[PDB]
Amino acid sequence: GFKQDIATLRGDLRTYAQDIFLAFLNKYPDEKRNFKNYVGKSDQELKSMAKFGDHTEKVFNLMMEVADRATDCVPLASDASTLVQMKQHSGLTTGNFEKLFVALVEYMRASGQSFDSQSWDRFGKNLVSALSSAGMK
Amino acid sequence: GFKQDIATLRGDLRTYAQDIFLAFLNKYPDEKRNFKNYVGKSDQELKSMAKFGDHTEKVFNLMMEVADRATDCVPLASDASTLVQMKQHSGLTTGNFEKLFVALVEYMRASGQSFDSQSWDRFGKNLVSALSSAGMK
């Protein structure tokens, strides 16, 4: 279930982080505007750069902490507030997060492994509603 | 304390993992008997070898999970059974693990941060005793 999936992702976090972030950028090419430095590069070109993996790994470490602290796939309000207030997230809206979790669930369903894709879809929806309650437009 | 230290290490895991594992190999150079490929290499040459980067990341990803599942720095018996039975660990004895943790604790004490070094010393001793009970020589 959801708790085991956190362990699966953590066990090979740098690899999963890169693959899931590429699935997001490829599904929603207009989202690369938040990431101007990745424009004009294929998947393999992005992965060869240490900065890409370094950054994504740190992102997914925080995502897994939020997921592990959730109750029944409902994140804590205090974790949603951290995500809203981070300077790096200034001017994001909840739709950016909605799209990230649609891509993440699609990746899990195509992987042919035993992810609890329903729990992740629910986590993404509950994270969007928590971000709005914590002040994100 | 110990739980916060897991969060500290996870926030810069790649760099902490390679640095601690290098501290282990430089304190105990005979431990290269298990890593014949690492002979004749400086730290900066090891860091640019793909499989050094791979073992080391996966060592620390899993070690952080074992730490997180522990109670008062005592690991789960099931976690010890998994570590003993890994086909990659067939040539190992508990002394290989003891030495890793002696190096890890020395690294934390020298860092000048706020690690709970005493807790990591207990965790390494308790992991060793759990590995023995699970079947490691």
Ligand code: HEM
């Ligand atoms: C639960 C979801 C998310 C988490 C856990 C998260 C976490 C983080 C973290 C930890 C960093 C700093 C990483 C580093 O040190 O390099 C970061 C940076 C950033 N995030 Fe997110 N993020 C999330 C969702 C998003 C989304 C949906 C977007 C946009 C589509 C976004 C855009 C950015 C940008 C633009 C940066 C700055 C790039 C940089 O580090 O220079 N994030 N995020």
Ligand code: HEM
């Ligand atoms: C808590 C401590 C440790 C954990 C959690 C751990 C975990 C792992 C993991 C997850 C793997 C698979 C890595 C991969 O192939 O990508 C692995 C392989 C290995 N572990 Fe460990 N390990 C630990 C300690 C050690 C120690 C102390 C030694 C030797 C002194 C050792 C020697 C190996 C060797 C030789 C392999 C296979 C070849 C290699 O990865 O270079 N491990 N270990």
Ligand SMILES: c1ccc2[nH]nnc2c1
């Ligand atoms: C994937 C999901 C969230 C992110 N925040 N910065 N970079 C990210 C990549």
